[PDB]
Design a protein around this ligand. Sequence first.
Ligand SMILES: *[C@@H]1O[C@H](CO)[C@@H](O[C@@H]2O[C@H](CO)[C@@H](O)[C@H](O)[C@H]2NC(C)=O)[C@H](O)[C@H]1NC(C)=O
Ligand SMILES: *[C@@H]1O[C@H](CO)[C@@H](O[C@@H]2O[C@H](CO)[C@@H](O)[C@H](O)[C@H]2NC(C)=O)[C@H](O)[C@H]1NC(C)=O
Ligand SMILES: *[C@@H]1O[C@H](CO)[C@@H](O[C@@H]2O[C@H](CO)[C@@H](O)[C@H](O)[C@H]2NC(C)=O)[C@H](O)[C@H]1NC(C)=O
Ligand SMILES: *[C@@H]1O[C@H](CO)[C@@H](O)[C@H](O)[C@H]1NC(C)=O
Ligand SMILES: *[C@@H]1O[C@H](CO)[C@@H](O)[C@H](O)[C@H]1NC(C)=O
Ligand SMILES: *[C@@H]1O[C@H](CO)[C@@H](O)[C@H](O)[C@H]1NC(C)=O
Ligand SMILES: *[C@@H]1O[C@H](CO)[C@@H](O)[C@H](O)[C@H]1NC(C)=O
Ligand SMILES: *[C@@H]1O[C@H](CO)[C@@H](O)[C@H](O)[C@H]1NC(C)=O
Ligand SMILES: *[C@@H]1O[C@H](CO)[C@@H](O)[C@H](O)[C@H]1NC(C)=O
Ligand SMILES: *[C@@H]1O[C@H](CO)[C@@H](O)[C@H](O)[C@H]1NC(C)=O
Lengths: 199, 237, 265, 50
Amino acid sequence: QKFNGLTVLPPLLTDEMIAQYTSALLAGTITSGWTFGAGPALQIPFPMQMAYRFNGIGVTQNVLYENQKLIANQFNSAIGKIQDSLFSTPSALGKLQDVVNHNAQALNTLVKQLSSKFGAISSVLNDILSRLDPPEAEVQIDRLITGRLQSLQTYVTQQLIRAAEIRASANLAATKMSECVLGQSKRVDFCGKGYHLMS
Amino acid sequence: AYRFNGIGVTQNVLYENQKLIANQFNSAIGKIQDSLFSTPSALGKLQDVVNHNAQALNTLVKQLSSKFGAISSVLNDILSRLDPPEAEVQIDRLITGRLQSLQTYVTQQLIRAAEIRASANLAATKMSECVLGQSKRVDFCGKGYHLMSFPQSAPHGVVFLHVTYVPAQEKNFTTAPAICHDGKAHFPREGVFVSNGTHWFVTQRNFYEPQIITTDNTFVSGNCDVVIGIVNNTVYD
Amino acid sequence: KSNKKFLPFQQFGRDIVDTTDAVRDPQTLEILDITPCSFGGVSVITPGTNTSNQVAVLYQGVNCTEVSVAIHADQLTPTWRVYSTGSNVFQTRAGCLIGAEYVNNSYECDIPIGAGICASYQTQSQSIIAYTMSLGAENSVAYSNNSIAIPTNFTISVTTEILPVSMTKTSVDCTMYICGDSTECSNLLLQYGSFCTQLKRALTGIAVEQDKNTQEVFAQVKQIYKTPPIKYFGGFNFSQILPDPSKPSKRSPIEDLLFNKVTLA
Amino acid sequence: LLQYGSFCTQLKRALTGIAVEQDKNTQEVFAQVKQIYKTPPIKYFGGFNF
Ligand SMILES: *[C@@H]1O[C@H](CO)[C@@H](O[C@@H]2O[C@H](CO)[C@@H](O)[C@H](O)[C@H]2NC(C)=O)[C@H](O)[C@H]1NC(C)=O
Ligand SMILES: *[C@@H]1O[C@H](CO)[C@@H](O[C@@H]2O[C@H](CO)[C@@H](O)[C@H](O)[C@H]2NC(C)=O)[C@H](O)[C@H]1NC(C)=O
Ligand SMILES: *[C@@H]1O[C@H](CO)[C@@H](O[C@@H]2O[C@H](CO)[C@@H](O)[C@H](O)[C@H]2NC(C)=O)[C@H](O)[C@H]1NC(C)=O
Ligand SMILES: *[C@@H]1O[C@H](CO)[C@@H](O)[C@H](O)[C@H]1NC(C)=O
Ligand SMILES: *[C@@H]1O[C@H](CO)[C@@H](O)[C@H](O)[C@H]1NC(C)=O
Ligand SMILES: *[C@@H]1O[C@H](CO)[C@@H](O)[C@H](O)[C@H]1NC(C)=O
Ligand SMILES: *[C@@H]1O[C@H](CO)[C@@H](O)[C@H](O)[C@H]1NC(C)=O
Ligand SMILES: *[C@@H]1O[C@H](CO)[C@@H](O)[C@H](O)[C@H]1NC(C)=O
Ligand SMILES: *[C@@H]1O[C@H](CO)[C@@H](O)[C@H](O)[C@H]1NC(C)=O
Ligand SMILES: *[C@@H]1O[C@H](CO)[C@@H](O)[C@H](O)[C@H]1NC(C)=O
């Protein structure tokens, strides 16, 4: 309801722009391999890039050149199963839902904290002002002031502590984007389980 | 030469372009001083720490002139113009306000120290992996193919100079996955089959250097009726 | 007017946050919805004062018709008002923007505003313009299934990275800060327990960690290695990063520039 | 409330810093490349289906 002095600001990048960035990354990695992450993009046919990657994990090229059709079929089926796996699993995106839930909960608590009395006659300033004289109203107003200041301080400290963790997660995601999408990784279990090919 | 071999280029390239490589390195080092000398927001990361610390200290000191709902913000006059039974009713409010100020300052300092520690851990990892060795992680020690790095010290921080190799002046070619000869398929040992329009060579991947196709730089391992896109030519023994 | 089905015995109406949102008129039984009057934040967009004195104003989270109506009736609290030409008011998802002319070119972002909108100072005379941010140059790679591209030359490039390591170590005395040198204040403060011991412990831990950070980053090696007196390395020149013996502090030229570039009771 | 000092300036500074960092996170993760690459009109890649 726009709350009481609380507002939400829109992010600088819209969803379309993020989709455009993702599309550019996909096109680059499909038509160039890993060359475009280190300089100008150099074209190469896709089966030859797959041969390069098999050579990178320790297998010779003739294996792929002789099992090309089988490898393509396996890749197609594996991609096809992902949509079904994500389509019918309830707790699939709990990590992304937790952020929204926590933010909504914190805002709701902050708003609800406005109906407390903190040991005063009323939680409304208007009636305190309309039924008391100035020398006696401040003795009630200051208690509300102290309580509401404490509520704001608690909210801000919690927000800072959550922002630190979000930043750590974003740093990890950026490292993964650099090392698993723009190249082929040799670190174990960093870009999936098995011998990494691409992402 | 060892480092060029580490990024996938043979040694003769450096041994034949030594003077050019040295000149390029000298010019690149020369430009860094000018780039840092005439850029205003170059060291904002190091300046932000100083600014934040000074701001926090100034706020803490300035918080001492508040009244917190008392007659005065000075203890001396409160003590000099009131009797003991009535002075504590004013002193306790100042006590509570100043305690709250100290608590806020300390919590903020802890939260900032955590982030500084994370940054220092990252810097130590970079010092180990980019200065004491050659790295293969992409975009960890600069943009390009990593060669080496040099450290320099700065107030409250460190500066890394990364040296990288970047390809240039590309050309387009016709390629094939294998060569058919005498009913046998041939794949390159390391490199790629390339064609300039009429003749076929084998070259290394990151630098154009055509060679004659021979049984010394290929292996047979198969037949000619399975590979898709195979091109048939001659292989000299 | 309200469309709430009040049972014949209620008077007020609340919501989840527990604030009044509906009421009944005593003299004529009728349900009235109550909505708060418009409020929000104000942002000021300016280039440097070295450049010009023109500004633009953003009213956050509001439609432009309401701000125009409030201005015409003189009901808006910030008394100052921008000239509001008929062609320099724009509506964005961040709010109402007054004082900038919207063009339909795309540039790199200069001053962020909102959902993809940026502002800049352009000579087009000089003025402030608003536009949609550009993501980059368009490129398409010539993909084919028998064509490859191979480089024929190279470049040696050098780049920089700056990282913070440590911060300032400070200490605070409780009694001096809170009570000065008053004995009555100290006796009163003694009744609050042991907050000051915790404060001292926290600050001391921070200082020790500050020293440990620098130790971990810089004390990598165990030997002090020295470079030979003759500085010939096959044509490579390291003079800009090696220590300079003429000056007293024995720093490289780049280190001197860095230490003079940072400005600090 | 004016008698309590400057807690509100600190609160505003903290929230503003949080918001700016929120924008910087997305910028660092997603704006990796400098060119906008496009895929060819004919989508044949040797039997792989994207
Ligand atoms: C690879 O690039 C270098 C750097 O541009 C080329 O060297 C330049 O060549 C031009 C043409 O003769 C000269 O005008 C420049 O003075 C050279 N630069 C330097 C630093 O010496 C080099 O010729 C290129 N190699 C090839 C095979 O084209
Ligand atoms: C290594 O580089 C430095 C810096 O460019 C060279 O020092 C310059 O030398 C020239 C010619 O002697 C002088 O005109 C400049 O004033 C020097 N610059 C500075 C900052 O002193 C140095 O000569 C180079 N090393 C070699 C062996 O040539
Ligand atoms: C790539 O995969 C998609 C998805 O499986 C294929 O699209 C399907 O094509 C069949 C036959 O034309 C249709 O019956 C399905 O309804 C399509 N699915 C969807 C979601 O549209 C597509 O044909 C494949 N590409 C090629 C070249 O075969
Ligand atoms: C190679 O030829 C293709 C097809 O015309 C062209 O698009 C590409 O730009 C060429 N490569 C170079 C480096 O000129
Ligand atoms: C391709 O290389 C062969 C080998 O020497 C040469 O004879 C021929 O002229 C070259 N063709 C072109 C177009 O450069
Ligand atoms: C060599 O290649 C040509 C063209 O693809 C083909 O017609 C011919 O049959 C091949 N040689 C043999 C012995 O099959
Ligand atoms: C009092 O107000 C009610 C509400 O409109 C009205 O129905 C009624 O006729 C009024 N009676 C008198 C005496 O004013
Ligand atoms: C904002 O103003 C425009 C211009 O009159 C109007 O068409 C639109 O309905 C308004 N929207 C809101 C939410 O007030
Ligand atoms: C800007 O882009 C083109 C210019 O020809 C036009 O179609 C579009 O409507 C313009 N946007 C405006 C005028 O707001
Ligand atoms: C790729 O090969 C197919 C053969 O199935 C051919 O029709 C197509 O033209 C080739 N791609 C291009 C860009 O020519």
